[PDB]
PDB file of C-alpha atoms in Angstrom:
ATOM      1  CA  UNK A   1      28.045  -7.846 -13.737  1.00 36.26           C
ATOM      2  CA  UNK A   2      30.457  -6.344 -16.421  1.00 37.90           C
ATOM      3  CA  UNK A   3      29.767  -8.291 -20.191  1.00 39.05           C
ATOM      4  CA  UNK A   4      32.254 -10.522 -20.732  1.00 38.95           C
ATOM      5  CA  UNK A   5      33.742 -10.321 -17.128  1.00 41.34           C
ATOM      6  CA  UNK A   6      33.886 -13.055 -14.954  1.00 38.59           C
ATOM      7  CA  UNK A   7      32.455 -12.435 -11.420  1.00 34.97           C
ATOM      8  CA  UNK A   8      32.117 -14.226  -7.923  1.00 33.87           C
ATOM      9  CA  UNK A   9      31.213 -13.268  -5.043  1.00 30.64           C
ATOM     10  CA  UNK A  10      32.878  -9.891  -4.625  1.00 27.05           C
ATOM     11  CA  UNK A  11      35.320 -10.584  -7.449  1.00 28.84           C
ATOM     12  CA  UNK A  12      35.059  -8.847 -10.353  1.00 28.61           C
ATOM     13  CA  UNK A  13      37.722 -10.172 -13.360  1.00 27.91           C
ATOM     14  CA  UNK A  14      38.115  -8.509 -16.860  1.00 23.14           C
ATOM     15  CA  UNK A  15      41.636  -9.448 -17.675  1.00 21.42           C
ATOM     16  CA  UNK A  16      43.169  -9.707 -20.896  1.00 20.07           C
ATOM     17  CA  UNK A  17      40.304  -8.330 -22.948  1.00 21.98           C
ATOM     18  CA  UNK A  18      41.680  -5.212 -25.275  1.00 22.74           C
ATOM     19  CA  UNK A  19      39.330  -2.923 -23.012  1.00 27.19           C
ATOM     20  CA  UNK A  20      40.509   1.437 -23.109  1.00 30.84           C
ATOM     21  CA  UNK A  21      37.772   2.021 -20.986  1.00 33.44           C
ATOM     22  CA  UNK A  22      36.493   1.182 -17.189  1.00 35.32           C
ATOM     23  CA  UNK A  23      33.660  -0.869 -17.461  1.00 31.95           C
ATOM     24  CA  UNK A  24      30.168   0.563 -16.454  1.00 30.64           C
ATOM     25  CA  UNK A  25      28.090  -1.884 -14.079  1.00 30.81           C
ATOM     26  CA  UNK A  26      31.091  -2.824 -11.475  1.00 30.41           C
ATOM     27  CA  UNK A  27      29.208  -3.837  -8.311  1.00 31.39           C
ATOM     28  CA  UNK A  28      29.578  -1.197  -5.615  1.00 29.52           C
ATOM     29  CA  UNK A  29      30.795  -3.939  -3.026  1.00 29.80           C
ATOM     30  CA  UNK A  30      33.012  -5.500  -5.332  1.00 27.94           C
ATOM     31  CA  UNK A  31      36.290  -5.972  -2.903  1.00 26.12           C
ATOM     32  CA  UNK A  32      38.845  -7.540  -5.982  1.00 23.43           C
ATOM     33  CA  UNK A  33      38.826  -5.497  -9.361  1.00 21.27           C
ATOM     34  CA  UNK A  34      41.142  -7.470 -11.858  1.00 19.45           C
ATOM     35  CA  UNK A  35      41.265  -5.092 -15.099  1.00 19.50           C
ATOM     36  CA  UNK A  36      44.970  -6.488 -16.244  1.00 21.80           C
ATOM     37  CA  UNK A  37      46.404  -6.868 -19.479  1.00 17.51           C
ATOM     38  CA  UNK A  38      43.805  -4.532 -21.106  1.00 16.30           C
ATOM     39  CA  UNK A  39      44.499  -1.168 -23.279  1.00 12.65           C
ATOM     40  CA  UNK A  40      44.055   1.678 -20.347  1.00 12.49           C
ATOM     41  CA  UNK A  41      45.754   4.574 -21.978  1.00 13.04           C
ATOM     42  CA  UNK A  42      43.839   6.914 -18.990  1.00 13.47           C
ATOM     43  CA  UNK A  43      41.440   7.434 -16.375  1.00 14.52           C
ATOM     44  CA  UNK A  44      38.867  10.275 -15.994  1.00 12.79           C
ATOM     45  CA  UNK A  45      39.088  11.886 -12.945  1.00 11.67           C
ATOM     46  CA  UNK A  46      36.642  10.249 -10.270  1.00  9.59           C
ATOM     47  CA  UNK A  47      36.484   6.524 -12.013  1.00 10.21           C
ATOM     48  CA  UNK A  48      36.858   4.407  -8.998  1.00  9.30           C
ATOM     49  CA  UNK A  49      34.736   6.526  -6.373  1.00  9.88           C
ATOM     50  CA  UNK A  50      31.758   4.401  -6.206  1.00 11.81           C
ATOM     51  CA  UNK A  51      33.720   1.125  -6.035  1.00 11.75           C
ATOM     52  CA  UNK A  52      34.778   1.690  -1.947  1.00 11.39           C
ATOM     53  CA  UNK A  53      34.276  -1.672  -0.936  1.00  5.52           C
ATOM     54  CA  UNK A  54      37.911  -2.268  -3.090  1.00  7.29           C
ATOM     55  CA  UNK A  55      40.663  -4.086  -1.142  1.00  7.34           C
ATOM     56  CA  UNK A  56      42.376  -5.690  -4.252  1.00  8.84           C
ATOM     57  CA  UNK A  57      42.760  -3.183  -7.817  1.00  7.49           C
ATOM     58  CA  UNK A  58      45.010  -4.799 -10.250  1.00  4.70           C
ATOM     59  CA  UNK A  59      45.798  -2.358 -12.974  1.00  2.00           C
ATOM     60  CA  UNK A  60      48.843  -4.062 -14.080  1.00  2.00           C
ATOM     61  CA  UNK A  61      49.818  -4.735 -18.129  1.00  2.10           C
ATOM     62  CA  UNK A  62      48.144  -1.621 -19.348  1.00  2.00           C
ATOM     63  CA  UNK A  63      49.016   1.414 -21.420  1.00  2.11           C
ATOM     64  CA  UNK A  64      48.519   4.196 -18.778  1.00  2.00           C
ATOM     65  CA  UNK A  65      50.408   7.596 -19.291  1.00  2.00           C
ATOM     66  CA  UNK A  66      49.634   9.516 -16.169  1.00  2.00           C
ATOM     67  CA  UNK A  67      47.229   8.985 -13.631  1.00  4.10           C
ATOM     68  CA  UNK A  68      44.359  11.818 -13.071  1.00 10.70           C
ATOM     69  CA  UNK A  69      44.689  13.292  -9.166  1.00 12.78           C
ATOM     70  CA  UNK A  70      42.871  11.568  -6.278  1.00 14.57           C
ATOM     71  CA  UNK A  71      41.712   8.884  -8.488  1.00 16.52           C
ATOM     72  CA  UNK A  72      42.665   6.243  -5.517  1.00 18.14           C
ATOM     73  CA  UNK A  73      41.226   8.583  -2.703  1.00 20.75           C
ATOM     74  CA  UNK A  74      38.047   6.948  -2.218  1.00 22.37           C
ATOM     75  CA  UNK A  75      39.894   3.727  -2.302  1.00 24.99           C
ATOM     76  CA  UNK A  76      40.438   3.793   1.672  1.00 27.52           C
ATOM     77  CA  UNK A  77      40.233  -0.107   2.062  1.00 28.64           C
ATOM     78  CA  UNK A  78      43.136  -1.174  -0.524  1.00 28.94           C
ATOM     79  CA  UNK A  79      45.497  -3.553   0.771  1.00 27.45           C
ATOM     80  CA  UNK A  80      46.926  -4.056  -2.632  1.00 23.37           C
ATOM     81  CA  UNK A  81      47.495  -2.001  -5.650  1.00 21.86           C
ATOM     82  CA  UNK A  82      49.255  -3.293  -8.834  1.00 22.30           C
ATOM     83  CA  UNK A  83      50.481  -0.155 -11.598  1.00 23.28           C
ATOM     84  CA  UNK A  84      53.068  -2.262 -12.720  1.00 21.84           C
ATOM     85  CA  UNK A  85      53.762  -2.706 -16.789  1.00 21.55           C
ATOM     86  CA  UNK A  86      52.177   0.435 -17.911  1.00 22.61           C
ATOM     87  CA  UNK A  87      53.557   3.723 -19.381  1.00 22.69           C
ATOM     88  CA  UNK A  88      53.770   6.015 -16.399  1.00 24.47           C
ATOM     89  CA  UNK A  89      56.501   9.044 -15.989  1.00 27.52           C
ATOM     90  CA  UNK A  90      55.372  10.532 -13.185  1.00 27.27           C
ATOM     91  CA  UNK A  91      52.493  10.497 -10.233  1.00 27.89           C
ATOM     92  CA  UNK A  92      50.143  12.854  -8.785  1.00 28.76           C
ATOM     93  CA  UNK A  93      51.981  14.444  -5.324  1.00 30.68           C
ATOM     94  CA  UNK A  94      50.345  12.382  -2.482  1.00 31.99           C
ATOM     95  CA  UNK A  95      48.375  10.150  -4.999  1.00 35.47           C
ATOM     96  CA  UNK A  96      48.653   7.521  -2.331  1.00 37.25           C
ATOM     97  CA  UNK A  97      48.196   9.232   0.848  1.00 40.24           C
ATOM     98  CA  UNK A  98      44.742   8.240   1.569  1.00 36.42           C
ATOM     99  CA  UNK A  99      45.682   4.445   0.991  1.00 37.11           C
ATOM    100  CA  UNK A 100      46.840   3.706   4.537  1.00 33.17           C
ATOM    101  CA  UNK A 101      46.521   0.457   4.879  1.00 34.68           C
ATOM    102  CA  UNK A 102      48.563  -0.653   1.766  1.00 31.19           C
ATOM    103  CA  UNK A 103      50.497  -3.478   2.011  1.00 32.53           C
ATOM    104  CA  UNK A 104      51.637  -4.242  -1.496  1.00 35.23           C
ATOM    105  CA  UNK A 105      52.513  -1.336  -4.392  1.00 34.69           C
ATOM    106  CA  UNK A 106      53.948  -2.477  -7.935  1.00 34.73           C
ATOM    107  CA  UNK A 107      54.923   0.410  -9.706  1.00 33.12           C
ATOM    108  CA  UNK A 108      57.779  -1.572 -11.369  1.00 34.91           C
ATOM    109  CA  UNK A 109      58.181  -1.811 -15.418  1.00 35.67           C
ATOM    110  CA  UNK A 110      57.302   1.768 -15.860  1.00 37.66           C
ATOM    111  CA  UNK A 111      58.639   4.810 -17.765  1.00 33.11           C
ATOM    112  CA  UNK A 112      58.910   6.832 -13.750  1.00 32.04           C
ATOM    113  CA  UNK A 113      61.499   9.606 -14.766  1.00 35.80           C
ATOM    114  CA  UNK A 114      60.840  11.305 -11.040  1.00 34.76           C
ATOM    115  CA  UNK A 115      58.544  10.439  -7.462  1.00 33.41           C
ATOM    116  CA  UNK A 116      56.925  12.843  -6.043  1.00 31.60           C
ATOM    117  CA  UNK A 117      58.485  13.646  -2.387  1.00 31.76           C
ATOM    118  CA  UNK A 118      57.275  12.041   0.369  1.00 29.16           C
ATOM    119  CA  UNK A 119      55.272   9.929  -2.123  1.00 27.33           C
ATOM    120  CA  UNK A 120      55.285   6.795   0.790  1.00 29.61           C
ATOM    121  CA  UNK A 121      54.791   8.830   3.811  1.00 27.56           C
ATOM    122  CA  UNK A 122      51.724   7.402   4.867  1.00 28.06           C
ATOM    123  CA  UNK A 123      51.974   4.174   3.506  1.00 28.43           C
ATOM    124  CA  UNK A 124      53.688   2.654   7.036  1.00 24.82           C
ATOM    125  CA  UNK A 125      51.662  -0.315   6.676  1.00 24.69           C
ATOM    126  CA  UNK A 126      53.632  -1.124   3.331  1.00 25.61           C
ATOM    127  CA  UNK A 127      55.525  -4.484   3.650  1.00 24.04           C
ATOM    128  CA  UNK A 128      56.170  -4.625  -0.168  1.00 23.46           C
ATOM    129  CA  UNK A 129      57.231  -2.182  -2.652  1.00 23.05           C
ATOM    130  CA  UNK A 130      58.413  -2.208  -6.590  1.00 23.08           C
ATOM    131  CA  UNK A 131      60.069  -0.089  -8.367  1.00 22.91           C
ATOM    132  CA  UNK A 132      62.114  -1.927 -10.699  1.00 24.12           C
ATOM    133  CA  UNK A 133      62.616  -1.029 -14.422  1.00 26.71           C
ATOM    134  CA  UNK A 134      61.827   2.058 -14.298  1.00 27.12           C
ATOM    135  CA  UNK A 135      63.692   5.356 -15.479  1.00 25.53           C
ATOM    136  CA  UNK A 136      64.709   7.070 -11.744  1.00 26.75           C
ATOM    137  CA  UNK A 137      68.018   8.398 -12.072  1.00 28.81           C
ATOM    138  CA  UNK A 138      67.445   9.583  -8.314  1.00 29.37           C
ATOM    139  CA  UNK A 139      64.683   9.258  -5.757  1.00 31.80           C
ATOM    140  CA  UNK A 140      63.746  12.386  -2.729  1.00 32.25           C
ATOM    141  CA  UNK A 141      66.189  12.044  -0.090  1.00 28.20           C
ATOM    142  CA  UNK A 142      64.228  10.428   3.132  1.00 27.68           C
ATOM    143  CA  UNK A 143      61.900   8.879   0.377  1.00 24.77           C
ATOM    144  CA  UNK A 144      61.935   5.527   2.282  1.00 25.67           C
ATOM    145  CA  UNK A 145      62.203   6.732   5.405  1.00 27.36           C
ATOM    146  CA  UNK A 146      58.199   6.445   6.996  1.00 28.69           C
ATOM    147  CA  UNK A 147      58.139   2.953   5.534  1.00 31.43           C
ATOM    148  CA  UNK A 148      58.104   0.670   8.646  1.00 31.25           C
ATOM    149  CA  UNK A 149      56.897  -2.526   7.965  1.00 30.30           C
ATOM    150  CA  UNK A 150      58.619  -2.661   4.840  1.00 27.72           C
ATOM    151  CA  UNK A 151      60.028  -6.431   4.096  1.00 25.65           C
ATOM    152  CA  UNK A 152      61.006  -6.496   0.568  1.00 28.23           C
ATOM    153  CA  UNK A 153      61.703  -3.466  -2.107  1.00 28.42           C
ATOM    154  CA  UNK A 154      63.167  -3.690  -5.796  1.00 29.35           C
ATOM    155  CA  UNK A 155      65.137  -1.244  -7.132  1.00 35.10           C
ATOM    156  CA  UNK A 156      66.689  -2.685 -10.299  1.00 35.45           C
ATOM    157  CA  UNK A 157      66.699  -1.834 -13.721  1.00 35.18           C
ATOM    158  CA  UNK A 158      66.765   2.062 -13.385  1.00 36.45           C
ATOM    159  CA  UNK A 159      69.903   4.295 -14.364  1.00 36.79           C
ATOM    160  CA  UNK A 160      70.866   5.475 -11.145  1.00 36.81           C
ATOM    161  CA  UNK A 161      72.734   8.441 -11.097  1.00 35.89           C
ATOM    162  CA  UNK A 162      75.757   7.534  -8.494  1.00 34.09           C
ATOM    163  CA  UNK A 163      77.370  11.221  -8.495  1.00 32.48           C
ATOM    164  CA  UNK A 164      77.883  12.685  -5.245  1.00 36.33           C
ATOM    165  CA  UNK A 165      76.612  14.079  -2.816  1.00 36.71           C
ATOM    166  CA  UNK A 166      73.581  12.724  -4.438  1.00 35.26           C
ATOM    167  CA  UNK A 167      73.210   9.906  -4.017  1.00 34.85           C
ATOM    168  CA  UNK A 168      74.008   9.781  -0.700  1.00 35.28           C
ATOM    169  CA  UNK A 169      70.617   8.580   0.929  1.00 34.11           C
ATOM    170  CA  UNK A 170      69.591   6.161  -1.299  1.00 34.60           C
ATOM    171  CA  UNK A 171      73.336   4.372  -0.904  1.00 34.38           C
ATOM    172  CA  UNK A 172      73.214   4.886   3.038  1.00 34.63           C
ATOM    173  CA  UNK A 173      69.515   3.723   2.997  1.00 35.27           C
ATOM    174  CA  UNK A 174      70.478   0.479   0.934  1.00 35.40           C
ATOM    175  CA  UNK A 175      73.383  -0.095   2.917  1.00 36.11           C
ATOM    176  CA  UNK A 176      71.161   0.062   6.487  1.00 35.77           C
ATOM    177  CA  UNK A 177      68.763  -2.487   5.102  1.00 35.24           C
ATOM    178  CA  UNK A 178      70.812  -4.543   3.066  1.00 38.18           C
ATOM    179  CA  UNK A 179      68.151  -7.596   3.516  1.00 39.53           C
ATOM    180  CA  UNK A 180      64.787  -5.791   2.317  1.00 42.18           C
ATOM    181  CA  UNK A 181      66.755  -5.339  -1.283  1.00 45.55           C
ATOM    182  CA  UNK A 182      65.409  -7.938  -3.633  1.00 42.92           C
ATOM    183  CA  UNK A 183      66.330  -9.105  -7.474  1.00 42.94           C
ATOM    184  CA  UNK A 184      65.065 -10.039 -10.384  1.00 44.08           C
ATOM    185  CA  UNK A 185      65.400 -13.595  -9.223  1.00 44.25           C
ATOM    186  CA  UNK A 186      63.283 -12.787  -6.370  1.00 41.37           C
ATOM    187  CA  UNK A 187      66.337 -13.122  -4.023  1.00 42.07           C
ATOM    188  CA  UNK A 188      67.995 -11.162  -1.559  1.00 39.98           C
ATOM    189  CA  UNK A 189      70.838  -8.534  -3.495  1.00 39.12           C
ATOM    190  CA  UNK A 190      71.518  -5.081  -1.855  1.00 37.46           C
ATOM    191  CA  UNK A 191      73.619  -5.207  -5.138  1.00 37.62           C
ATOM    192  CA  UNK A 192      71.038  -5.299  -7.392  1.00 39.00           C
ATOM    193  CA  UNK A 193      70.462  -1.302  -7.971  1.00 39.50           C
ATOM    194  CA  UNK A 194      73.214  -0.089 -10.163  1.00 35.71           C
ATOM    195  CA  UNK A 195      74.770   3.185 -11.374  1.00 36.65           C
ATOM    196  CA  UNK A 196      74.031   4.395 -14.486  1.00 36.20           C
ATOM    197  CA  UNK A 197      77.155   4.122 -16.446  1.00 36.61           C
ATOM    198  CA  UNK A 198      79.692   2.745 -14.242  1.00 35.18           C
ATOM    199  CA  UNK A 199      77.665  -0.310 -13.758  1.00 37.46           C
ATOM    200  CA  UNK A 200      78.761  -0.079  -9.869  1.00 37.09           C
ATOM    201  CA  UNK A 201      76.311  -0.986  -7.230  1.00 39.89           C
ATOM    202  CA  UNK A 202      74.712   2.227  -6.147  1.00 39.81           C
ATOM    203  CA  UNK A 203      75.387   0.701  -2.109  1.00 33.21           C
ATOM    204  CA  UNK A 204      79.037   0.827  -3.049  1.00 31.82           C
ATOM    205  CA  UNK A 205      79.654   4.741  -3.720  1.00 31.55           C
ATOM    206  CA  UNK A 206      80.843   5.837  -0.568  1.00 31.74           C
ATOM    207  CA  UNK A 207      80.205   9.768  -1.165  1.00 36.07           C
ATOM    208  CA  UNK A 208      82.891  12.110   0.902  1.00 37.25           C
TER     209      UNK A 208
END
């Protein structure tokens, strides 16, 4: 296993470590790949393909910029994928299309200035998404849309832009699932996403 990573069965953690690089030697059937609070800054294309067996890739607390294409497309099996606390301002179009069986995606605490459209279209397994703190003044109208088992989504902490006709989906979106909206505090707040300067809830702009 990877020096100075911690392994167990399957498991494979090197959290917290001041790593820039993927380590080499990462078991092929490793199922849990815990590479958090490390120094990422990128990924060559292709790191992850030999590591299929993945159902678990934390990547959270990290310094990545941008994220090469298809590095996840190999990664059929994930169930949960953490990209939270890094430095991303955009994704790859359909850089999670081939991750089907998703359940959990933190892409919250990022520098996300745009999402690709239909960025979640496949992901209709997805019962938990973050996007909080990030930099989205808007999001592609329908963007939400595919996302049927969805239970709980944060959209906090991002400057909204509430102009009209705009933002008309994501405040008629918010507004139809007023209980999946979630806070800071972990609790339900269909509140919680707020325009940009007014300081309004974005639910609350009733466009004409």
């Amino acid at each position: 296993c990877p020096s100075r990573c911690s392994c167990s069965g399957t498991t494979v953690e090197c959290y917290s470590q001041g790593r820039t690089s993927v380590p080499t030697g990462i078991p092929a059937q490793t199922t849990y790949l815990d590479l958090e609070t490390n120094s990422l800054k990128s990924l060559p294309n292709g790191v992850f393909d030999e590591l299929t067996s993945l159902t678990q890739l934390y990547l959270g607390g990290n310094k990545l910029q941008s994220l090469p294409n298809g590095v996840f497309n190999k990664l059929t099996s994930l169930t949960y994928l953490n990209l939270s606390t890094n430095q991303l301002q955009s994704l790859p179009n359909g850089v999670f299309d081939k991750l089907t069986q998703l359940k959990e995606l933190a892409l919250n605490t990022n520098q996300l200035q745009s999402l690709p459209d239909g960025v979640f279209d496949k992901l209709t397994q997805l019962k938990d998404l973050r996007l909080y703190q990030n930099q989205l003044k808007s999001v592609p109208d329908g963007v939400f849309d595919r996302l049927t088992s969805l239970q709980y989504i944060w959209l906090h902490d991002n400057p909204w832009d509430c102009t009209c006709p705009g933002i008309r989906y994501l405040s008629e979106w918010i507004n139809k699932h007023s209980g999946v909206v979630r806070n800071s505090a972990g609790s339900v707040a269909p509140d919680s996403a707020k325009c940009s300067g007014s300081g309004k809830p974005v639910r609350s702009i009733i466009c004409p």
